[PDB]
């Protein structure tokens, strides 16, 4: 129930979960170990690997620390363990629709007050982290283990287009507060973080699909101009 | 401890038992006999008169004299007990081991069954008797591995022999206490402690409720106690020498009883007059099983030293001259091997079996070269002697009739070997670093892709075994297992540092060096020990065409320009001091 050592269980499972294909094995006074001449079974550990990422996913609740290790550890277990993969998607996928705005019209693309955890007003969810992660395995999805993906084009493709016609004011932030002492200061300037983040990963994102279309690439110029003109109007007020 | 690996350079398939036979089991069910053989396997064989090869399966998994057996869960398990201190459980069915009990700390001599409770016990050399659940053991899968153990206490000193009743409620043991102790399994408490014998007890038997107890002993005599009046009501002395082996009967009236003097009689325990010779063997009893079929016993199977396992009828002794002359069901055998000689090249080895064959074997392949029949040994060493030395690199054990080859960290790499010298086509060798990757050839991290170390491979079949020195067995496989995926993460485990060096690392060992003397026959020099005279013949002509001018002596005697210093000190040398070599010009 201790806090603080639930992170380094989750750095335990993601260190030797992202660097062993095969985990698992092959008392008391009177209690002794016998040696069973048992056949390593694939299915056995499969299940195995399964419960620990099963587990993995209950600590996506925690803290933002946590939640920042698995988006950054989830990406290693994935290439690792290929019978994984699934299990991955449908974790990050779950958590994608925490936050992202399904309707097609309404703006802005995803609930960035949803990320934030007000009690002191702090960051709750890494969204640009989480929207990194899941590019990076989809990426890696589509090139290796081919030879809800076809979904995660869908969203990422609709998350590009509204986030481009959104008009910087749906996500609450020229310069309302910005400060660094007042609540609603901190809590725009965390939110201005999210967005620039998210920015940069589908700049990331619409560079690879298409190839070398220009329509993407007017999405891209346009994307950065988003991030850049928020960029300039955090670095002018600090 | 020190890890060693060991191998045997055997066949594939081991039909026959290569030595004697300790404990014998029958399933009336499927007519099948088990034999436990002092060479480590157990077989199975089936007692159908019909079928002239009775050989089913072998079950190989013992390192050592397999001692006990016992057949339970209706012909289902089978437990074993064997030398390499392990308790092991089988499926008797198909004939594999299922699980490993390493409770005990010396050799496995005894195991009790219960028929009813389906209890098993096992006792050993280290005076511990520890009591087990047949099923409890046959449930343990990879996850549940663990199990509650109940041991008796009590003995004094090692057990030889173990009995409890079909109910499960009366335990004996047999040691060289001289004693028998006897405990409640269900309770584990002593009950008595029956006294009488005055040497070691081998054989215990107990009737269906557990009142009346059978032992045999060195002694030579046989006993029959009452354990409700906790006294020895009659004592039978038909034997020359020591009782080794007991059966009776269903109606416990009549006794089988065989030990060292060949002989099996069947005595009425009413009247020890009415004594019947059943038979003489050829070696000393070490178990009988009685055939149960029908009432009485049509036949009884006999164990003996010998690789050969017999079947005496029993057919008149209820209706001196031995009953029976020649046994009605024979069950072949093959030959031990009772002598080696390792020869000059620390290569080849003649050895000599109890058929008194003679057969050439080469060490580093882990095969045989050639039979040469029976021809003497002792000569045939004389004509297979040359004048060369090479440092003893590995050592050979013949306590299971076969050639088990152990390979220890202080030796394994003292034998460096030039190419020409051996039989591959010059780079210089080292036997046991060649060996090494041989046997885990098949072994993926040993692998850089080329596989073993490219002269020569073992067979795939051989039993590659890694175990402590003067220990317990860490892991058994075979040379072809090596890829496996469970094989590889317990090789990973048990395989030893200066293993690793060789086979994985790729390092290579040290260079023994030899220093010695230059004199003028009428200046230290170190050099290698392969080095040959005629390196040292060309030193001292650049000193002062070579070989035709400079004749090298030592002890006074000529040496020849293609021998090495490693065979002048050993053979000519003869003396504890730096080898001292005179230069003289021819």
Same mark, same amino acid.
């Given at each position: ?39 390593? !079974? ?38 690792? !363990?290929?019978?994984?993969? !699934?299990?991955?998607?449908?974790? #990050? ?12 019209? #309404? ?23 989480? #929207? ?10 589509? !090139? ?36 660094? @002492? ?39 110029? @346009? ?16 | ?11 594939? %398939? ?45 079950? +190989? ?15 289902? =398990? ?56 047949? *099923? =409890? ?10 199990? /509650? =153990? ?11 022999? &173990? ?23 269900? /309770? ?101 099983? &009685? ?22 009828? &029993? ?47 080469? %060490? ?15 000569? +045939? ?10 440092? *003893?690199?590995?050592?050979?054990? $013949? ?9 220890? +960290? ?20 080292? $036997? ?16 850089? %892709? ?41 090789? *990973? ?18 260079? *023994? ?28 002509? +650049? ?44």
């Amino acid at each position: 129930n201790q806090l603080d050592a639930r992170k380094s269980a989750v750095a335990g499972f993601l260190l030797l979960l992202k660097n062993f294909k095969v985990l698992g094995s092959l008392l008391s006074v009177s209690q002794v170990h016998v040696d069973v001449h048992s056949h390593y !079974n694939s299915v056995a550990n499969e299940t195995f690997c399964l419960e620990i990422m099963d587990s993995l996913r209950r600590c996506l609740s925690q803290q933002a620390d946590v939640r920042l290790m698995l988006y950054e550890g989830f990406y290693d277990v994935l290439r690792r !363990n290929s019978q994984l993969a !699934n299990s991955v998607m449908q974790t #990050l996928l779950s958590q994608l629709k925490q936050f992202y705005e399904p309707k097609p019209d #309404l703006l802005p693309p995803l609930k960035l007050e949803a990320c934030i955890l007000t009690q002191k007003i702090s960051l709750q969810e890494p969204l640009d982290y989480l #929207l990194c992660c899941i590019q990076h395995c989809l990426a890696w999805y589509k !090139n290796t283990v081919i030879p809800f993906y076809e979904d995660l084009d869908d969203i990422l493709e609709s998350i590009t287009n509204r986030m481009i016609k959104s008009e910087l004011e749906d996500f609450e932030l020229k310069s309302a507060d910005f400060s660094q @002492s007042t609540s609603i200061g901190i809590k725009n300037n965390i939110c201005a973080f999210l967005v620039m983040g998210v920015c940069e990963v589908l700049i990331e994102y619409n560079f690879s699909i298409s190839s070398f279309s220009k329509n993407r690439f007017e999405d891209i110029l @346009s994307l950065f101009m988003c991030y850049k003109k928020l960029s300039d109007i955090l670095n002018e007020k600090a | 401890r020190k890890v060693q690996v060991s191998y045997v350079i055997r066949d594939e %398939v081991e039909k026959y038992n290569r030595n004697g036979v300790n404990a014998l089991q029958l399933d009336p069910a499927l007519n099948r006999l088990f034999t436990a053989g002092r060479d480590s396997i157990i077989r199975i064989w089936s007692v159908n008169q019909h079928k002239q090869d009775p050989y089913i399966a072998s079950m +190989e998994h013992h390192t050592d004299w397999v001692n006990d057996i016992v057949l339970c869960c209706n012909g289902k =398990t089978l437990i074993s007990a064997s030398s390499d201190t392990t308790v092991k459980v089988w499926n008797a069915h198909k004939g594999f081991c299922m699980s490993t009990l390493r409770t005990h700390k010396d050799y496995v001599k005894a195991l009790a069954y219960a028929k009813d409770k389906e209890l098993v016990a096992s006792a050993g050399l280290d005076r511990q008797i520890f009591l087990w659940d047949v *099923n =409890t053991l046959t449930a343990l899968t990879a996850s549940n591995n663990t199990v /509650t =153990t109940s041991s008796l206490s009590g003995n004094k000193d090692s057990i030889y022999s &173990l009995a409890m009743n079909q109910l499960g409620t009366i335990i004996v043991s047999g040691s060289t206490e001289k004693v028998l102790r006897v405990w409640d399994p269900r /309770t584990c408490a002593k009950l008595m402690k029956l006294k009488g014998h005055t040497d070691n007890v081998k054989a215990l038997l107990l009737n269906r409720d557990g009142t009346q107890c059978l032992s045999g002993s060195s002694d030579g005599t046989i006993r029959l106690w009452s354990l409700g009046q906790q006294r020895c009501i009659a004592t039978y002395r038909v034997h020359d020498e020591g009782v080794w082996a007991l059966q009776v009967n269903d109606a416990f009236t009549h006794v089988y009883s065989g030990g060292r003097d060949r002989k099996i009689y069947c005595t009425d325990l009413r009247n020890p007059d009415i004594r019947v010779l059943i038979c003489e063997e050829k070696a000393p009893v070490l178990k009988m099983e &009685l055939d149960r079929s029908a009432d009485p016993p049509p036949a009884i199977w006999v164990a003996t030293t010998k690789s050969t396992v017999n079947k005496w009828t &029993l057919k008149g002794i209820h209706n001196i001259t031995p009953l029976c002359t020649q046994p009605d069901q024979v069950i072949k055998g093959g030959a031990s091997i009772i002598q080696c000689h390792i020869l000059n090249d620390k290569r080849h080895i003649l050895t000599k079996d109890t058929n008194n064959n003679v057969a050439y074997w080469d %060490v580093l392949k882990a095969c045989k070269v050639e039979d040469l029949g029976k021809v003497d040994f002792e000569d +045939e060493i004389k004509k297979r002697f040359k004048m060369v030395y090479v440092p *003893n690199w590995f050592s050979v054990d $013949l306590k299971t009739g076969m050639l088990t080859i152990t390979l220890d +960290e202080s030796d394994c790499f003292a034998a460096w070997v030039s190419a020409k010298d051996a039989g591959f086509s010059d780079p210089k060798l080292n $036997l046991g670093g060649l060996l090494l990757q041989a046997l885990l050839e098949y072994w993926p991290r040993t692998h850089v %892709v080329q596989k073993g170390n490219g002269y020569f491979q073992v067979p795939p079949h051989t039993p590659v075994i890694f175990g402590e020195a003067g220990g317990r067995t860490l892991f058994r496989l075979l040379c072809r297992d090596s890829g496996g995926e469970t094989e590889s993460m317990l090789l *990973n485990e048990t395989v030893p540092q200066w293993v690793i060096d060789i086979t994985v690392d790729k390092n290579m060992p040290k260079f *023994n060096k030899i220093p010695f003397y230059l004199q003028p026959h009428a200046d230290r020099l170190s050099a290698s020990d392969m080095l040959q005279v005629r390196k040292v013949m060309e030193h001292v002509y +650049e000193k002062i065409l070579a070989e035709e001018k400079i004749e090298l002596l030592c002890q006074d005697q000529v040496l020849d320009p293609n021998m090495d210093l490693r065979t002048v000190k050993h053979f000519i040398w003869k003396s504890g001091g730096d080898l001292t070599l005179h230069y003289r010009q021819k």
